[PDB]
Amino acid sequence: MNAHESKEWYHASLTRAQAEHMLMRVPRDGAFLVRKRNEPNSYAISFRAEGKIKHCRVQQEGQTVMLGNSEFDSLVDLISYYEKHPLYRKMKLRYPINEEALEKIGTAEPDYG
Amino acid sequence: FELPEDPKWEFPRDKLTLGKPLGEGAFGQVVMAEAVGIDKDKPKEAVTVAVKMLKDDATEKDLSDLVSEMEMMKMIGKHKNIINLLGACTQDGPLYVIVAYASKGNLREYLRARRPPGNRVPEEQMTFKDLVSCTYQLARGMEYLASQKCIHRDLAARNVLVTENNVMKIADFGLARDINNIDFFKETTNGRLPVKWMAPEALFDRVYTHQSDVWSFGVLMWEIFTLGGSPYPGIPVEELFKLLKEGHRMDKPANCTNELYMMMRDCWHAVPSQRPTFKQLVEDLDRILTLTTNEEYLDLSQ
């Protein structure tokens, strides 16, 4: 169930503003990440869809994670599902994002300013 | 009958190609046009612009009015939330006032086509955060306008333009006045009066200050959150003043939070000094916008 802790798209410690900073550097719909929230048993999936950045609450309870009306055994199951099934407006999850992915498909952060 | 020269703002009439009408008033008209080289950095590139001008049935006074409005825009200077003055044709021919083209029309039209379902632009339907963003931008434009010690005297959704990137541009400077070192404008002529946007002191004493602009700002806020609604529904203008002195104010729009309504009601304070300044409006709207922006979560229940 906690197999998500290994995945490239999961972040145990990451703020909303940080996830925005990362996603703003990947202007592709389907770019996404999952972050733990401060509230117990809460996560958020942060993703891009139709050009804009979105955040969704994901609650865990017992043996189940919930997103809207959908229920899964685990976060890994939730993510795997929304790769093959639209999450928001025909948009499927496509590009898992972390700082190493951003080195490769991300716009460069300006060193000077 | 002739107008004084101003070389830095003057623009060649051949350089300009008048086109599709955008607005018509009684004596005034605004047309779309192509102006090549109006950008000084891109001397050969054609720019889409808007051109304000008179009908043929305009009087001498109609002309001096348009000249004054143009000089107001010169004095006010540039700001991201005030429509940009590009230049003019003042010499040998009709007066053309050239201004930045806003491709999404005026704020009232813009809002009305972006309502929930029953012209319409469904993919650009307004959200609460967008509405607040509109209001904050206009607050900033006014804060700058007031810092230039000028008053607008005609804030209304019909006089705000929306650009292609959804930027709010304050426009129509035809009632605008310089009040530097005097801090009130006292209207001695009667005139065109946008009665449903005026503070009671302006309706009564014919005197205008930064405080009465703030009153108009509150009515503008109402227009925004009713997504282009018309103020004081079912009430004729001859009755508004008495109604206003005896405490009447518009109801809270549903798209409006209690907090934003209270802001609204505060702009409409009976005592002008108890109203917020545009500076205070900006600070409080910045706060509200940020809170709203940081607290948005997409709801996939529907």
Ligand SMILES: Nc1ncnc2c1ncn2[C@@H]1O[C@H](COP(=O)(O)OP(=O)(O)CP(=O)(O)O)[C@@H](O)[C@H]1O
């Ligand atoms: N730069 C611009 N871009 C796009 N549309 C514009 C525009 N300027 C004006 N318009 C259109 O024309 C309308 C505004 O005309 P404007 O407010 O400037 O003068 P007016 O018709 O109100 C007579 P008066 O200036 O004496 O009050 C707007 O509502 C808008 O629809």
Ligand SMILES: [Mg+2]
């Ligand atoms: Mg108008």
Ligand SMILES: [Mg+2]
């Ligand atoms: Mg007007």
